[PDB]
Design a binder for these strands. Structure first.
Length: 96
DNA sequence: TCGAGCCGGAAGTTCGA
DNA sequence: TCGAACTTCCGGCTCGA
């Protein structure tokens, strides 16, 4: 249930691109047991990023990273038109 | 009445060409 | 060698039960 490293298998061919990784993990395995992926147009909410949130901080050899970070670094990520957060709730994320 | 998560700004080091 | 890129630290705002 972690086909990320198996799907990616994308080697140390340079650090991955932030959103490309997140976007690759998005349209990936089930995502029903650890998060919520609607089966309609393109809506993505983070229900329980327990494995995602700790993988995010693990890549940096950092043991634990709360989710506030993503609301932090992901927010400042409005540099390119790639992932915009939804003004609906707070754990609702979206991509263009 | 009380706690929790989200956001605002800046600085610092490294990548590919 | 050049410029941009993503990360992390400090402290502050408001909502629901």
């Amino acid at each position: 249930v972690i086909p990320a490293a198996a799907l990616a298998g994308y080697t140390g061919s340079g650090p991955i691109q932030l959103w490309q990784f997140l976007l690759e993990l998005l349209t990936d395995k089930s995502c029903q047991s650890f998060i919520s992926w609607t089966g309609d147009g393109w809506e993505f909410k983070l229900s329980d990023p327990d494995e995602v949130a700790r993988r995010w901080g693990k890549r940096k050899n950092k043991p634990k990273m709360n989710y506030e970070k993503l609301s932090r670094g992901l927010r400042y990520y409005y540099d390119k038109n790639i992932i915009h957060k939804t003004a609906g709730k707070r754990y609702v994320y979206r991509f263009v």
